[PDB]
Amino acid sequence: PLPSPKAWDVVLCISGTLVSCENALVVAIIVGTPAFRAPMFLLVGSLAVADLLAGLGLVLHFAAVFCIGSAEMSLVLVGVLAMAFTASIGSLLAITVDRYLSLYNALTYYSETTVTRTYVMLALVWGGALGLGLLPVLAWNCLDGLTTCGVVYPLSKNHLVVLAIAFFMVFGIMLQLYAQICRIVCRKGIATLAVVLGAFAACWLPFTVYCLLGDAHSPPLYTYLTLLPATYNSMINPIIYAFRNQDVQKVLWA
């Protein structure tokens, strides 16, 4: 007797499908033409790949939990979603650091070296995504039943709290970065970047705060209500970061 899907589960499956479609389009645009090989588009490509992985993981997780039942597969796919979300946030941070460094090297008349540091940032982001996405597989999970399980069933409470700590450190870093970018160029662009930062924060603060204010016995509705904004953020990230470029729009026109 496989569980019958609920409304919220179908909602997350649909959102995962939409995210997968959008980020597949973005990745296909980037990789199809050999023009986009600059270290500026590599970070956008990494973010798009991470979001596409998250969407495909959502769809495959719904399918493998409610259509083709398996117990040793849902845990792996949940780990994959965790890795994809961590990689998405790391790529967002890498895209800001690079953007700040290049306004900074543009109003200082210093030649910029961004051929190796971009590779280092990508390697660090993906290593953090894999090292914070392999814990549910073998290290940190409540499937043993004696590990104070967290709000998410496959994930442990301590692992979730570690993820929240890392996210808040990243949020502080990217609040400083969006605070200096507001000073170097100092008017509508400042408002637009503030709106972008607010859109990023209003989508990830709910879940990353409920992770600390939530208990294992809390209603399952809260998990969906706080995780849906994360999927919405992954949905809107390509629009802000990939379809706002003139070259990508020109490729669309062709």
Ligand X SMILES: CCCCCCCC/C=C\CCCCCCCC(=O)NCCO
Ligand Y SMILES: CCCCCCCCCCCCO
Ligand Z SMILES: CC(C)Oc1cc(Cl)ccc1CNc1cc(-c2ccccc2)nc2ncnn12
Q: What is the 3-state secondary structure (H, E, C) of the chain?
A: CCCCCCHHHHHHHHHHHHHHHHHHHHHHHHHHCCCCCCHHHHHHHHHHHHHHHHHHHHHHHHHHHHCCCCHHHHHHHHHHHHHHHHHHHHHHHHHHHHHHHHHHCCCCCCCCCCCCHHHHHHHHHHHHHHHCCCHHHHHCECCCCCCCECCCCCEEHHHHHHHHHHHHHHHHHHHHHHHHHHHHCCCHHHHHHHHHHHHHHHHHHHHHHHHHHCCCCCCHHHHHHHHHHHHHHHHHHHHHHCCCCHHHHHHHHC
* Closest-approach residue to ligand X (CB): 128
Residue of 213, 216, 221, 252 interacting with ligand Y (CB under 6 A)? 213
Residue of 56, 152, 235, 242 interacting with ligand X (CB under 6 A)? 152
Q: Is 56 in the site for ligand X (CB under 6 A)?
A: no
Q: Closest approach of Cβ 179 to its own copies, in Å?
A: 8
Residue of 28, 107, 165, 216 interacting with ligand Y (CB under 6 A)? 165
Select 114 or 245, whichever has its Cβ closest to ligand A1AJD.
Answer: 114
- Out of its own copies, ligand Y, ligand Z, none, what residue 206 binds, judged by CB under 5 to 8 A for its kind, is ligand Y
Q: Closest approach of Cβ 47 to ligand A1AJD, in Å?
A: 20
Q: By CB under 8 A, name the binding residues for its own copies.
A: 158, 161, 164-165, 168-177, 180, 209, 212-213
Q: By CB under 6 A, name the binding residues for ligand Y.
A: 158, 162, 165, 202, 205-206, 209-210, 213-214, 218, 222
